[PDB]
Amino acid sequence: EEKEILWNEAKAFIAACYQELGKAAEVKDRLADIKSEIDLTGSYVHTKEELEHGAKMAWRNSNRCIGRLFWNSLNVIDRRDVRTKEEVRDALFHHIETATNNGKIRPTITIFPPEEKGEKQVEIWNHQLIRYAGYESDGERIGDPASCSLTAACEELGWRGERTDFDLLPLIFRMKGDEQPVWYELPRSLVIEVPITHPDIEAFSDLELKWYGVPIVSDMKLEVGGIHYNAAPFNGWYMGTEIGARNLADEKRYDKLKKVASVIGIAADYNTDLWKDQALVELNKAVLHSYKKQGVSIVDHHTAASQFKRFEEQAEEAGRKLTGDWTWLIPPISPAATHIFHRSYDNSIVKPNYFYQDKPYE
Amino acid sequence: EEKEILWNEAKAFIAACYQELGKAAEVKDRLADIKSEIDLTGSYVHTKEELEHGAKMAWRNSNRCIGRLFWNSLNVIDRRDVRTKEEVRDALFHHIETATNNGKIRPTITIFPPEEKGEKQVEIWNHQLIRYAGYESDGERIGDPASCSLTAACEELGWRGERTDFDLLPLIFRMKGDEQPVWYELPRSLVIEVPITHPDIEAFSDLELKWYGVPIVSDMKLEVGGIHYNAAPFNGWYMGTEIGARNLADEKRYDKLKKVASVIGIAADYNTDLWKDQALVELNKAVLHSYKKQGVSIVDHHTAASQFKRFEEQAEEAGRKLTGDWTWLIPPISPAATHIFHRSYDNSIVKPNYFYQDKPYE
Ligand code: HEM
Ligand code: HEM
Ligand SMILES: Cc1cc(N)nc(-c2ccc(CNCCc3cccc(F)c3)cc2)c1
Ligand SMILES: Cc1cc(N)nc(-c2ccc(CNCCc3cccc(F)c3)cc2)c1
Ligand SMILES: C[C@H](O)[C@H](O)[C@H]1CNc2nc(N)[nH]c(=O)c2N1
Ligand SMILES: C[C@H](O)[C@H](O)[C@H]1CNc2nc(N)[nH]c(=O)c2N1
Ligand SMILES: [Cl-]
Ligand SMILES: [Cl-]
């Protein structure tokens, strides 16, 4: 029935994996046992080596990611042994700690048990492990509007946020068998935050802006060789523009450009003054400066693009087809200043890969 | 043979044209005669009304153009009567004058005789009627590199440029029957140029930057109802970013960002300083300021995007499908600050339209 599609994707993944690993002769025998195990059990189990390389291939294949140069040094943590919510919680806690690494961020992924019959063993509700709540009630807007629905779902479960603009959401996830997810408050000792100051303009601190150190995406599905790891949070370090040009700048997010314009001392009255553009630049300089000053890893969009160029060169020379999403790879500020803007990319989907999946709330 | 495809496109265009013009009942009779005229002659001739509306529909359908809100007030000049190179030259001269309009730019198109049997009556070599030459010889780079090949072709024809960074190319075009194009120097009295100064930073004039007032694209084909107007130059006013973010900024164009960084007094040493982004913003403020100060029409990318939003609303309410090229509609600076960035567009080709065509040089 579905062993068909499972077997096909297994054949493709194992062949490619073992080839890249220099283990091409072990394929037919490895494929043999797998083909067998699928018949009796309806599935198969990745070795640690396969799972680790699959996770790395998935990152390499993420069309929208500019950071892909470092795909091969991803730190893979195999947590397929977890059975309890305490183990899940502690695995998420450790991921935060080890990835943060006192500010010298380690690109890391923690992999939980995969879907069995399409049945989730663990269902993580958070978009990112560290993320700020958002509230909207009777005209009143607080925090991160992108978090409004998860925040409301959290508050249905007994949690209550302090309603600052930067409430840390609890971890929230559901175990197979349980009807409701559980939630656990984040130990603040584990969460590095960076207050936003500007190198030249002292008044910038009057904005009282901050962001969290480590983006840890926890709601995408890792697909490896027909196996569906629906719960597999992964992190890197930020590209400054994600914070300065979007999270803090978008009208539907924190919407800070008018306030930025004010503290840097320019008028926000005329489009021709390009006050939004100027504000975007100073806000983005502030973000890079602040992360650097605090000893927290971050990359600017120019360096990131230069790295991606090397990713392109590396692919070609390894004889691998390159795929990418131009509309996502271009940075939201000065895009024509990067080589990305001036070439095209094939947006084909190659597996292994990370995929969106339906949210349990909403 | 090809009367087939000609008749099909005629049927589609006339129906749509006459409908939009409120002349739906005149269609079948108009279509009748056209169907007849195609049989005897192999072609058909647009009335002035049809040609004018077709040109406007072509602009409305240009997926890559952010300026489309004003499609319906395009000024159409019908020059299908020209027979001689003197008439062509004088028609091009007049187009420049009337479109410029002392700085209050009028979006205008001059339409020359269409292709007959696929045979061009008039073949315009210029990319734009007003454009700067470019030279590259023995390491030495002068002027606009995008113009290198046309400039070389011009210099094969007896013309010689002064080799400043802003040599105005002559008009160059070929008449049916002639083996070589002719060229005519531009009367400087007709060409408005704008020196680039900055509102706040006096040193900016040390760069001695300038650009021409009016972009007049002269190498695209207007297609209307199966008729191919290969020679039909059209102009609007500039969006500032075309000049400040591309023509003056691209490494393969005038490459001025390092010099901009210097005169505005910032270092150009570290990517994390975002010095390119800052330079782009000040250069783009300078361009808008300078055009405004001189009384020459121009639009900033924010106003232009707001206008385009109205173009979208106007389309919907008129029951017309909207088409666009997202990768071209987004401006090359602060794109995420415009609504364009945050929605998608169907990039389907609708006719009438303007099309690239093969260059006669090169
Ligand atoms: C090491 C530093 C990294 C940087 C600077 C980086 C940069 C980025 C950026 C800027 C985006 C766009 C996000 C957005 O605009 O919403 C992105 C998307 C993405 N990145 Fe990376 N990334 C990094 C590491 C990683 C890692 C470790 C993985 C997984 C193993 C990964 C997989 C992805 C995926 C799947 C997306 C697409 C998310 C979506 O479509 O919503 N990246 N990356
Ligand atoms: C009125 C002011 C106008 C503005 C501000 C404007 C703006 C623009 C801009 C910024 C581009 C992108 C060019 C590039 O990046 O290389 C563009 C492309 C285009 N515009 Fe407009 N435009 C205007 C008027 C017109 C008119 C009058 C027509 C024709 C009747 C036209 C047809 C087009 C076409 C065909 C393109 C695509 C050129 C290509 O693909 O290379 N536009 N427009
Ligand atoms: C590993 C990693 C590093 C880094 N610097 N950034 C990320 C990251 C950031 C944001 C996102 C989220 N992208 C958008 C998801 C989305 C898509 C559609 C609608 C929405 F509201 C939200 C994914 C990955 C991931
Ligand atoms: C009417 C009008 C107004 C305005 N503001 N801009 C233009 C305009 C500007 C530039 C262009 C040229 N676009 C790129 C053509 C091209 C395409 C591919 C390769 C190349 F080297 C050049 C076309 C229209 C046209
Ligand atoms: C409509 C458009 O495709 C969409 O809003 C995209 C555009 N490019 C993007 N690129 C990145 N990196 N992140 C985004 O959220 C978006 N938004
Ligand atoms: C590769 C890419 O499609 C191409 O270089 C485009 C990108 N978007 C653009 N958009 C505009 N307006 N003008 C351009 O020249 C380009 N270049
Ligand atoms: Cl984020
Ligand atoms: Cl131009």
PDB file of all heavy atoms in Angstrom, chain A residues 226-255:
ATOM      1  N   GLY A 226      11.920   8.446   3.204  1.00  0.00           N
ATOM      2  CA  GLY A 226      10.584   7.943   3.473  1.00  0.00           C
ATOM      3  C   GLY A 226      10.214   7.918   4.946  1.00  0.00           C
ATOM      4  O   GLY A 226       9.078   7.581   5.307  1.00  0.00           O
ATOM      5  N   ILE A 227      11.164   8.271   5.808  1.00  0.00           N
ATOM      6  CA  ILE A 227      10.872   8.356   7.235  1.00  0.00           C
ATOM      7  C   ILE A 227      10.556   9.803   7.603  1.00  0.00           C
ATOM      8  O   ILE A 227      11.281  10.720   7.207  1.00  0.00           O
ATOM      9  CB  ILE A 227      12.028   7.820   8.098  1.00  0.00           C
ATOM     10  CG1 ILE A 227      12.366   6.379   7.710  1.00  0.00           C
ATOM     11  CG2 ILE A 227      11.658   7.872   9.570  1.00  0.00           C
ATOM     12  CD1 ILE A 227      11.229   5.402   7.944  1.00  0.00           C
ATOM     13  N   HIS A 228       9.473   9.994   8.353  1.00  0.00           N
ATOM     14  CA  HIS A 228       8.965  11.327   8.679  1.00  0.00           C
ATOM     15  C   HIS A 228       9.254  11.745  10.119  1.00  0.00           C
ATOM     16  O   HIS A 228       8.529  11.373  11.045  1.00  0.00           O
ATOM     17  CB  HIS A 228       7.454  11.392   8.403  1.00  0.00           C
ATOM     18  CG  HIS A 228       7.111  11.389   6.947  1.00  0.00           C
ATOM     19  ND1 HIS A 228       6.305  12.345   6.368  1.00  0.00           N
ATOM     20  CD2 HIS A 228       7.487  10.558   5.948  1.00  0.00           C
ATOM     21  CE1 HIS A 228       6.191  12.097   5.077  1.00  0.00           C
ATOM     22  NE2 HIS A 228       6.900  11.017   4.794  1.00  0.00           N
ATOM     23  N   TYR A 229      10.318  12.514  10.302  1.00  0.00           N
ATOM     24  CA  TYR A 229      10.650  13.049  11.613  1.00  0.00           C
ATOM     25  C   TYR A 229       9.935  14.397  11.787  1.00  0.00           C
ATOM     26  O   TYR A 229      10.497  15.462  11.496  1.00  0.00           O
ATOM     27  CB  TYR A 229      12.177  13.173  11.766  1.00  0.00           C
ATOM     28  CG  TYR A 229      12.935  11.861  11.569  1.00  0.00           C
ATOM     29  CD1 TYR A 229      13.463  11.511  10.326  1.00  0.00           C
ATOM     30  CD2 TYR A 229      13.127  10.979  12.633  1.00  0.00           C
ATOM     31  CE1 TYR A 229      14.158  10.313  10.144  1.00  0.00           C
ATOM     32  CE2 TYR A 229      13.819   9.786  12.462  1.00  0.00           C
ATOM     33  CZ  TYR A 229      14.331   9.459  11.218  1.00  0.00           C
ATOM     34  OH  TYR A 229      15.011   8.271  11.052  1.00  0.00           O
ATOM     35  N   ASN A 230       8.680  14.335  12.236  1.00  0.00           N
ATOM     36  CA  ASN A 230       7.838  15.524  12.392  1.00  0.00           C
ATOM     37  C   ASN A 230       8.326  16.420  13.521  1.00  0.00           C
ATOM     38  O   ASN A 230       8.032  17.624  13.555  1.00  0.00           O
ATOM     39  CB  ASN A 230       6.392  15.113  12.680  1.00  0.00           C
ATOM     40  CG  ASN A 230       6.255  14.412  14.021  1.00  0.00           C
ATOM     41  OD1 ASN A 230       6.558  13.225  14.142  1.00  0.00           O
ATOM     42  ND2 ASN A 230       5.821  15.153  15.043  1.00  0.00           N
ATOM     43  N   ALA A 231       9.049  15.815  14.461  1.00  0.00           N
ATOM     44  CA  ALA A 231       9.599  16.540  15.597  1.00  0.00           C
ATOM     45  C   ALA A 231      11.119  16.465  15.516  1.00  0.00           C
ATOM     46  O   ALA A 231      11.718  15.434  15.845  1.00  0.00           O
ATOM     47  CB  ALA A 231       9.100  15.930  16.917  1.00  0.00           C
ATOM     48  N   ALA A 232      11.737  17.554  15.066  1.00  0.00           N
ATOM     49  CA  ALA A 232      13.187  17.600  14.920  1.00  0.00           C
ATOM     50  C   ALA A 232      13.702  19.035  14.898  1.00  0.00           C
ATOM     51  O   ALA A 232      14.144  19.531  13.855  1.00  0.00           O
ATOM     52  CB  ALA A 232      13.609  16.859  13.660  1.00  0.00           C
ATOM     53  N   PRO A 233      13.668  19.706  16.060  1.00  0.00           N
ATOM     54  CA  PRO A 233      14.094  21.111  16.080  1.00  0.00           C
ATOM     55  C   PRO A 233      15.562  21.316  15.674  1.00  0.00           C
ATOM     56  O   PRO A 233      16.452  20.520  16.030  1.00  0.00           O
ATOM     57  CB  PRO A 233      13.857  21.539  17.529  1.00  0.00           C
ATOM     58  CG  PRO A 233      13.745  20.258  18.315  1.00  0.00           C
ATOM     59  CD  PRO A 233      13.176  19.248  17.371  1.00  0.00           C
ATOM     60  N   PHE A 234      15.800  22.382  14.917  1.00  0.00           N
ATOM     61  CA  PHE A 234      17.148  22.692  14.442  1.00  0.00           C
ATOM     62  C   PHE A 234      17.409  24.187  14.577  1.00  0.00           C
ATOM     63  O   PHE A 234      16.468  24.993  14.506  1.00  0.00           O
ATOM     64  CB  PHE A 234      17.321  22.242  12.987  1.00  0.00           C
ATOM     65  CG  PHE A 234      16.336  22.868  12.028  1.00  0.00           C
ATOM     66  CD1 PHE A 234      16.580  24.125  11.465  1.00  0.00           C
ATOM     67  CD2 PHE A 234      15.161  22.198  11.686  1.00  0.00           C
ATOM     68  CE1 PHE A 234      15.665  24.707  10.573  1.00  0.00           C
ATOM     69  CE2 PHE A 234      14.241  22.767  10.810  1.00  0.00           C
ATOM     70  CZ  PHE A 234      14.494  24.028  10.248  1.00  0.00           C
ATOM     71  N   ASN A 235      18.676  24.553  14.778  1.00  0.00           N
ATOM     72  CA  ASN A 235      19.071  25.958  14.890  1.00  0.00           C
ATOM     73  C   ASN A 235      20.330  26.290  14.093  1.00  0.00           C
ATOM     74  O   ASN A 235      21.136  25.406  13.765  1.00  0.00           O
ATOM     75  CB  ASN A 235      19.357  26.309  16.349  1.00  0.00           C
ATOM     76  CG  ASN A 235      20.644  25.690  16.838  1.00  0.00           C
ATOM     77  OD1 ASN A 235      20.704  24.486  17.061  1.00  0.00           O
ATOM     78  ND2 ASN A 235      21.692  26.503  16.980  1.00  0.00           N
ATOM     79  N   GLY A 236      20.502  27.576  13.805  1.00  0.00           N
ATOM     80  CA  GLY A 236      21.769  28.101  13.322  1.00  0.00           C
ATOM     81  C   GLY A 236      22.001  29.366  14.122  1.00  0.00           C
ATOM     82  O   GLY A 236      21.488  29.486  15.256  1.00  0.00           O
ATOM     83  N   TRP A 237      22.765  30.301  13.558  1.00  0.00           N
ATOM     84  CA  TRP A 237      22.773  31.680  14.059  1.00  0.00           C
ATOM     85  C   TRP A 237      21.945  32.569  13.121  1.00  0.00           C
ATOM     86  O   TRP A 237      21.662  32.177  11.988  1.00  0.00           O
ATOM     87  CB  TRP A 237      24.195  32.216  14.180  1.00  0.00           C
ATOM     88  CG  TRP A 237      24.998  32.012  12.939  1.00  0.00           C
ATOM     89  CD1 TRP A 237      24.998  32.801  11.814  1.00  0.00           C
ATOM     90  CD2 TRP A 237      25.934  30.954  12.689  1.00  0.00           C
ATOM     91  NE1 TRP A 237      25.882  32.294  10.885  1.00  0.00           N
ATOM     92  CE2 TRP A 237      26.468  31.163  11.400  1.00  0.00           C
ATOM     93  CE3 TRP A 237      26.377  29.855  13.439  1.00  0.00           C
ATOM     94  CZ2 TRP A 237      27.403  30.304  10.839  1.00  0.00           C
ATOM     95  CZ3 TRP A 237      27.308  29.008  12.886  1.00  0.00           C
ATOM     96  CH2 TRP A 237      27.820  29.238  11.598  1.00  0.00           C
ATOM     97  N   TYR A 238      21.529  33.746  13.591  1.00  0.00           N
ATOM     98  CA  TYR A 238      20.726  34.645  12.754  1.00  0.00           C
ATOM     99  C   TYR A 238      21.554  35.325  11.663  1.00  0.00           C
ATOM    100  O   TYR A 238      22.760  35.553  11.836  1.00  0.00           O
ATOM    101  CB  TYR A 238      20.128  35.752  13.598  1.00  0.00           C
ATOM    102  CG  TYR A 238      18.750  35.471  14.163  1.00  0.00           C
ATOM    103  CD1 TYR A 238      18.567  35.265  15.523  1.00  0.00           C
ATOM    104  CD2 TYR A 238      17.630  35.464  13.338  1.00  0.00           C
ATOM    105  CE1 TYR A 238      17.288  35.040  16.057  1.00  0.00           C
ATOM    106  CE2 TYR A 238      16.362  35.238  13.848  1.00  0.00           C
ATOM    107  CZ  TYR A 238      16.196  35.024  15.206  1.00  0.00           C
ATOM    108  OH  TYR A 238      14.925  34.804  15.703  1.00  0.00           O
ATOM    109  N   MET A 239      20.894  35.665  10.552  1.00  0.00           N
ATOM    110  CA  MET A 239      21.407  36.682   9.640  1.00  0.00           C
ATOM    111  C   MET A 239      20.763  37.973  10.128  1.00  0.00           C
ATOM    112  O   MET A 239      19.550  37.998  10.389  1.00  0.00           O
ATOM    113  CB  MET A 239      21.004  36.369   8.193  1.00  0.00           C
ATOM    114  CG  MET A 239      21.526  37.363   7.148  1.00  0.00           C
ATOM    115  SD  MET A 239      21.442  36.680   5.476  1.00  0.00           S
ATOM    116  CE  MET A 239      19.705  36.966   5.090  1.00  0.00           C
ATOM    117  N   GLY A 240      21.553  39.030  10.317  1.00  0.00           N
ATOM    118  CA  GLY A 240      21.027  40.256  10.917  1.00  0.00           C
ATOM    119  C   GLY A 240      19.689  40.761  10.367  1.00  0.00           C
ATOM    120  O   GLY A 240      18.783  41.159  11.138  1.00  0.00           O
ATOM    121  N   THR A 241      19.536  40.724   9.044  1.00  0.00           N
ATOM    122  CA  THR A 241      18.292  41.211   8.416  1.00  0.00           C
ATOM    123  C   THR A 241      17.015  40.511   8.902  1.00  0.00           C
ATOM    124  O   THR A 241      15.924  41.105   8.870  1.00  0.00           O
ATOM    125  CB  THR A 241      18.358  41.086   6.900  1.00  0.00           C
ATOM    126  OG1 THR A 241      18.610  39.716   6.550  1.00  0.00           O
ATOM    127  CG2 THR A 241      19.476  41.954   6.369  1.00  0.00           C
ATOM    128  N   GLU A 242      17.128  39.257   9.335  1.00  0.00           N
ATOM    129  CA  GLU A 242      15.941  38.556   9.840  1.00  0.00           C
ATOM    130  C   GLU A 242      15.359  39.301  11.024  1.00  0.00           C
ATOM    131  O   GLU A 242      14.149  39.281  11.241  1.00  0.00           O
ATOM    132  CB  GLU A 242      16.268  37.136  10.287  1.00  0.00           C
ATOM    133  CG  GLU A 242      16.601  36.155   9.175  1.00  0.00           C
ATOM    134  CD  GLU A 242      17.023  34.803   9.741  1.00  0.00           C
ATOM    135  OE1 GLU A 242      18.228  34.623  10.018  1.00  0.00           O
ATOM    136  OE2 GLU A 242      16.153  33.923   9.909  1.00  0.00           O
ATOM    137  N   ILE A 243      16.238  39.949  11.788  1.00  0.00           N
ATOM    138  CA  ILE A 243      15.845  40.683  12.982  1.00  0.00           C
ATOM    139  C   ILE A 243      15.575  42.158  12.673  1.00  0.00           C
ATOM    140  O   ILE A 243      14.496  42.683  12.985  1.00  0.00           O
ATOM    141  CB  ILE A 243      16.935  40.588  14.061  1.00  0.00           C
ATOM    142  CG1 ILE A 243      17.288  39.124  14.321  1.00  0.00           C
ATOM    143  CG2 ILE A 243      16.485  41.267  15.347  1.00  0.00           C
ATOM    144  CD1 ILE A 243      18.383  38.924  15.343  1.00  0.00           C
ATOM    145  N   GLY A 244      16.557  42.821  12.065  1.00  0.00           N
ATOM    146  CA  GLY A 244      16.474  44.251  11.819  1.00  0.00           C
ATOM    147  C   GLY A 244      15.543  44.677  10.700  1.00  0.00           C
ATOM    148  O   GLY A 244      15.039  45.806  10.709  1.00  0.00           O
ATOM    149  N   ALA A 245      15.314  43.791   9.733  1.00  0.00           N
ATOM    150  CA  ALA A 245      14.598  44.177   8.516  1.00  0.00           C
ATOM    151  C   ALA A 245      13.212  43.568   8.504  1.00  0.00           C
ATOM    152  O   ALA A 245      12.374  43.936   7.676  1.00  0.00           O
ATOM    153  CB  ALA A 245      15.379  43.755   7.277  1.00  0.00           C
ATOM    154  N   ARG A 246      12.961  42.634   9.424  1.00  0.00           N
ATOM    155  CA  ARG A 246      11.692  41.914   9.403  1.00  0.00           C
ATOM    156  C   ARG A 246      10.995  41.829  10.769  1.00  0.00           C
ATOM    157  O   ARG A 246       9.923  42.428  10.961  1.00  0.00           O
ATOM    158  CB  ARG A 246      11.919  40.514   8.845  1.00  0.00           C
ATOM    159  CG  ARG A 246      12.552  40.530   7.502  1.00  0.00           C
ATOM    160  CD  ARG A 246      11.548  41.153   6.495  1.00  0.00           C
ATOM    161  NE  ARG A 246      11.084  40.068   5.657  1.00  0.00           N
ATOM    162  CZ  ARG A 246       9.887  39.514   5.718  1.00  0.00           C
ATOM    163  NH1 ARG A 246       8.960  39.983   6.538  1.00  0.00           N
ATOM    164  NH2 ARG A 246       9.610  38.492   4.923  1.00  0.00           N
ATOM    165  N   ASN A 247      11.596  41.079  11.697  1.00  0.00           N
ATOM    166  CA  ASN A 247      10.991  40.862  13.007  1.00  0.00           C
ATOM    167  C   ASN A 247      10.705  42.176  13.721  1.00  0.00           C
ATOM    168  O   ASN A 247       9.622  42.378  14.266  1.00  0.00           O
ATOM    169  CB  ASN A 247      11.885  39.965  13.878  1.00  0.00           C
ATOM    170  CG  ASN A 247      12.111  38.598  13.263  1.00  0.00           C
ATOM    171  OD1 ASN A 247      11.392  38.192  12.346  1.00  0.00           O
ATOM    172  ND2 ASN A 247      13.111  37.877  13.767  1.00  0.00           N
ATOM    173  N   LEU A 248      11.687  43.070  13.710  1.00  0.00           N
ATOM    174  CA  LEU A 248      11.527  44.376  14.343  1.00  0.00           C
ATOM    175  C   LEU A 248      10.888  45.439  13.419  1.00  0.00           C
ATOM    176  O   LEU A 248      10.332  46.424  13.910  1.00  0.00           O
ATOM    177  CB  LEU A 248      12.866  44.855  14.900  1.00  0.00           C
ATOM    178  CG  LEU A 248      13.410  44.020  16.067  1.00  0.00           C
ATOM    179  CD1 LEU A 248      14.732  44.567  16.569  1.00  0.00           C
ATOM    180  CD2 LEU A 248      12.400  43.976  17.199  1.00  0.00           C
ATOM    181  N   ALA A 249      10.940  45.228  12.100  1.00  0.00           N
ATOM    182  CA  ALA A 249      10.538  46.261  11.130  1.00  0.00           C
ATOM    183  C   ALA A 249       9.166  46.090  10.480  1.00  0.00           C
ATOM    184  O   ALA A 249       8.533  47.086  10.137  1.00  0.00           O
ATOM    185  CB  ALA A 249      11.596  46.422  10.033  1.00  0.00           C
ATOM    186  N   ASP A 250       8.720  44.853  10.258  1.00  0.00           N
ATOM    187  CA  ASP A 250       7.463  44.635   9.536  1.00  0.00           C
ATOM    188  C   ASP A 250       6.304  45.302  10.269  1.00  0.00           C
ATOM    189  O   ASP A 250       6.252  45.274  11.505  1.00  0.00           O
ATOM    190  CB  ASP A 250       7.147  43.143   9.455  1.00  0.00           C
ATOM    191  CG  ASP A 250       7.899  42.427   8.356  1.00  0.00           C
ATOM    192  OD1 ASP A 250       8.715  43.066   7.643  1.00  0.00           O
ATOM    193  OD2 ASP A 250       7.660  41.201   8.214  1.00  0.00           O
ATOM    194  N   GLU A 251       5.367  45.879   9.519  1.00  0.00           N
ATOM    195  CA  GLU A 251       4.204  46.495  10.146  1.00  0.00           C
ATOM    196  C   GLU A 251       3.390  45.478  10.943  1.00  0.00           C
ATOM    197  O   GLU A 251       2.819  45.812  11.986  1.00  0.00           O
ATOM    198  CB  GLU A 251       3.334  47.193   9.094  1.00  0.00           C
ATOM    199  CG  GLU A 251       3.886  48.563   8.687  1.00  0.00           C
ATOM    200  CD  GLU A 251       3.139  49.199   7.527  1.00  0.00           C
ATOM    201  OE1 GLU A 251       1.912  48.978   7.394  1.00  0.00           O
ATOM    202  OE2 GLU A 251       3.795  49.929   6.753  1.00  0.00           O
ATOM    203  N   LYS A 252       3.357  44.236  10.461  1.00  0.00           N
ATOM    204  CA  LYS A 252       2.601  43.175  11.117  1.00  0.00           C
ATOM    205  C   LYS A 252       3.434  42.422  12.164  1.00  0.00           C
ATOM    206  O   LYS A 252       2.989  41.418  12.727  1.00  0.00           O
ATOM    207  CB  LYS A 252       2.024  42.215  10.069  1.00  0.00           C
ATOM    208  CG  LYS A 252       0.937  42.865   9.208  1.00  0.00           C
ATOM    209  CD  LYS A 252       0.259  41.864   8.284  1.00  0.00           C
ATOM    210  CE  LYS A 252      -0.766  42.556   7.384  1.00  0.00           C
ATOM    211  NZ  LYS A 252      -1.386  41.629   6.388  1.00  0.00           N
ATOM    212  N   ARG A 253       4.642  42.913  12.424  1.00  0.00           N
ATOM    213  CA  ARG A 253       5.446  42.401  13.532  1.00  0.00           C
ATOM    214  C   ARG A 253       5.610  43.503  14.574  1.00  0.00           C
ATOM    215  O   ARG A 253       4.610  44.043  15.051  1.00  0.00           O
ATOM    216  CB  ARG A 253       6.795  41.895  13.028  1.00  0.00           C
ATOM    217  CG  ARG A 253       6.663  40.745  12.047  1.00  0.00           C
ATOM    218  CD  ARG A 253       6.056  39.490  12.688  1.00  0.00           C
ATOM    219  NE  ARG A 253       6.871  38.923  13.770  1.00  0.00           N
ATOM    220  CZ  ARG A 253       8.011  38.256  13.575  1.00  0.00           C
ATOM    221  NH1 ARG A 253       8.488  38.093  12.341  1.00  0.00           N
ATOM    222  NH2 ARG A 253       8.685  37.757  14.611  1.00  0.00           N
ATOM    223  N   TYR A 254       6.840  43.860  14.924  1.00  0.00           N
ATOM    224  CA  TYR A 254       7.040  44.882  15.958  1.00  0.00           C
ATOM    225  C   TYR A 254       6.936  46.327  15.454  1.00  0.00           C
ATOM    226  O   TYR A 254       6.823  47.256  16.257  1.00  0.00           O
ATOM    227  CB  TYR A 254       8.363  44.660  16.695  1.00  0.00           C
ATOM    228  CG  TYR A 254       8.299  43.553  17.732  1.00  0.00           C
ATOM    229  CD1 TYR A 254       8.441  42.215  17.368  1.00  0.00           C
ATOM    230  CD2 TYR A 254       8.089  43.848  19.069  1.00  0.00           C
ATOM    231  CE1 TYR A 254       8.381  41.203  18.322  1.00  0.00           C
ATOM    232  CE2 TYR A 254       8.028  42.844  20.029  1.00  0.00           C
ATOM    233  CZ  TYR A 254       8.176  41.529  19.646  1.00  0.00           C
ATOM    234  OH  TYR A 254       8.112  40.536  20.616  1.00  0.00           O
ATOM    235  N   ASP A 255       6.985  46.514  14.138  1.00  0.00           N
ATOM    236  CA  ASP A 255       6.655  47.812  13.533  1.00  0.00           C
ATOM    237  C   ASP A 255       7.433  48.994  14.132  1.00  0.00           C
ATOM    238  O   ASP A 255       6.837  49.991  14.542  1.00  0.00           O
ATOM    239  CB  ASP A 255       5.156  48.068  13.701  1.00  0.00           C
ATOM    240  CG  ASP A 255       4.651  49.208  12.826  1.00  0.00           C
ATOM    241  OD1 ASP A 255       5.369  49.595  11.872  1.00  0.00           O
ATOM    242  OD2 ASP A 255       3.542  49.712  13.086  1.00  0.00           O
TER     243      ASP A 255
END
